[PDB]
Amino acid sequence: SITENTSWNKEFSAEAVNGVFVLCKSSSKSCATNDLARASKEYLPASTFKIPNAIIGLETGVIKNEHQVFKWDGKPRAMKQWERDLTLRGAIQVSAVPVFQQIAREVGEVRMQKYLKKFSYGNALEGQLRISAVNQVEFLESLYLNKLSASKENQLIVKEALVTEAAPEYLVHSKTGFSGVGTESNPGVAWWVGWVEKETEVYFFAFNMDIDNESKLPLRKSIPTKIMESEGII
Amino acid sequence: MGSITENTSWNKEFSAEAVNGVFVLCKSSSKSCATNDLARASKEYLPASTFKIPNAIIGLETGVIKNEHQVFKWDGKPRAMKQWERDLTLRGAIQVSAVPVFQQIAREVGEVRMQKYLKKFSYGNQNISGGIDKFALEGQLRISAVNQVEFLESLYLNKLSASKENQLIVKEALVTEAAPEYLVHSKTGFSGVGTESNPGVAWWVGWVEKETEVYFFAFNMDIDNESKLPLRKSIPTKIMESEGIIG
Ligand SMILES: *C(=O)[C@@H](NC(=O)Cc1ccccc1)[C@@H]1N[C@@H](C(=O)O)C(C)(C)S1
Ligand SMILES: *C(=O)[C@@H](NC(=O)Cc1ccccc1)[C@@H]1N[C@@H](C(=O)O)C(C)(C)S1
Structure with a gap:
């Protein structure tokens, strides 16, 4: 259940x-957003695809362990x-694309295809696979709860890998994405997805925006942060 | 670990x-350490709130702590x-180092199970006298700076006598600082003011993952006054800043 907030x-x-922006408390069964229509519209995942990729790399044993x-x-x-x-x-x-290109090469297109279906992930940083902000949030929840079709151990490895900010009373797992500068009529997409643990509570978030001017990029973080701080999350 | 050298600067x-x-600092790739005092590096003190680390691992391995979401x-x-x-x-x-919570955890584990695990972990001088909720804070268990880095390295490499899963859970719970270039796991400890002529101890223990390298560390100091407590962190930070590790 997704509800619209014009404030x-x-x-x-x-x-x-x-x-x-899509933000959910406790469970992705009740979320809030600024645009209902866009919340479910599907865009290229860009570098946020590194998350499912990493899980699949470890599952297939292409990535040997956490210390690789x-x-x-x-x-x-x-x-x-x-x-x-x-x-x-x-x-x-640092979002090193060739490292993850090489992992996916070994995984193979057919194997990757399967696990993605299994994860209910989506429909490259430019391909044929797209994902919505609602979809991202449902996927990140499953990862947090250890519910993906993967060993608990491997999901924990990727969970620690995604830690971006740590404080005595809150912890942030997140990943940015950016497809490149586009035209006014053919714009690029910028992503920031993740979740926050605060107190005994958990908050899932996913943000995307069009980008035809490179200097507007910091807004993929400042806007979601203005919001999450106003809610008392961070 | 492998080797140690005294660095008096x-x-x-x-x-x-x-x-x-x-202060004891070790570099994982080369299995080698540096310390400012070889003698105190070997001296055993009360573990205090650093015992929450083994205590948390055992808490999980025996079912007392159900999972990471409890x-x-x-x-x-x-x-x-x-x-x-x-x-x-x-x-x-x-x-927040919530003592009564881990004491209850310790109670449920029991005297015999708590012993068996500290044996397999090689944790300190291995003794649990005074009561099953007293030994770490003000009892008869003691551990050295050198022993702390050996224990912590085993945990990092998932080599302790517990499931990988459980060792991973505690590892995430120990994250304290996060930057794009490095990540810090750590825990503090503090026994009390003791007395003048017989002081208490304050610890800082952890490890820093940075590039492909990993750096294990342990710090402890004599302490009789509460105002000195911030130093348990500010000194090791200073040393690690000048070595280009954190900050
Ligand atoms: C994921 O989008 C990656 N982006 C690209 O490889 C495309 C690109 C766009 C502009 C300059 C260079 C490459 C990587 N992730 C982003 C991000 O996280 O913001 C980077 C810009 C770091 S590249
Ligand atoms: C671990 O040592 C814990 N210490 C104590 O419970 C002993 C104590 C000392 C003075 C007053 C009350 C109790 C925890 N570690 C310290 C610390 O991190 O500063 C606490 C005082 C938070 S309890």
Whole structure:
């Protein structure tokens, strides 16, 4: 059950942004959003696909365990932070695409296909697979509860890998995504998805927006944060 | 672990704050450690609230703690610290260091089961005198800085005598700082003021995952005054900053 909240439309209007935020307490059986229509509309997952990819990599034993080191082959890559040896968390945090391209190559298209169906994930950083903000939140819940078709052990490994902010009374698991600058008529998409544990409570969130100007990128974080802080979540 | 060397240039931070204590830093890839005082690095002290680490692992391995999603319900009755007067998760109870919660956990485990596990963990001098809720805080169990890093490294590598699953749960519950380049797991401890001429102890233990490297650490100091307590963290941080680990 998803319900519409117009009280935050001042932020989207002031920033000239077309996007959607979905935030749920306890269980994804009652969520809130700024745009009902967009909440269920499906966009390219971009780098948020690293989450299911990592689970599948470990399930198939392509990634041997949590302590796996992905050696850099020494060839130039697209960004500097990727030009080094990386751990699972390292590769997820700097978002090193070639590391995860290589994992998926070994997994094979047919195996990946199957597990995705199994996870109810969705319909690459540009392909044929798309996912909604409602879909993302339902998937992240299952991961938190250990409910995915995967060993409990492997879901825990990816759960720790996704930790982005830690405090004595709250913990944040999250991942950004960004498909690239687009046209006014063919815009890119930016993502931030995750969940917050606070007190004995748990909050699931997923945000996306169109992006035709690169400098509008920080708003994928500032807007969801303005909201979540106003709710007393962080 | 593998090797240890005395590095006396760390004593600067110690003399500055008038602190009588020790710091042990180990680098995982090369199995080697550095410390400012070889002798205190080997001396055994009360584990205090660092015992919550083995206590949490055993709590799970025996069914007493059901899983990672269990809530420890407050009865509405006043507790020794304001911080403790609420329902806590496993991470919650560990982060605010809620003594009565882990004492109840210890009670349910039992005398014989608690012994058997500390044996397999190689935890300290292995003794549980005074009562089944007294030994860690003010009893007869003792452990050294060197022993703490050995214990913590086993846990990191999932090598302790428990399920991988359970070792992972406690590992997440111990996360205290998170940046894009590094992640810190840690726990504090503090026995009390003791007396003048017979002080109490304060600990900081953990490990830092950073790049492909991992760094285990343990710190402890003599303490008789509560105002010195922040130093249990500010000194080890200083040492680790100048070595380019955190911050
Ligand atoms: C996931 O989207 C990844 N993005 C790309 O590889 C496309 C791209 C777009 C602009 C510049 C370079 C590459 C990685 N994840 C994002 C993100 O998390 O924001 C990066 C921009 C780090 S690349
Ligand atoms: C672990 O040592 C715990 N310490 C005690 O319960 C002993 C104590 C000392 C003074 C007053 C009351 C109880 C926990 N660790 C410390 C700490 O982290 O500062 C606490 C005082 C929070 S209890």
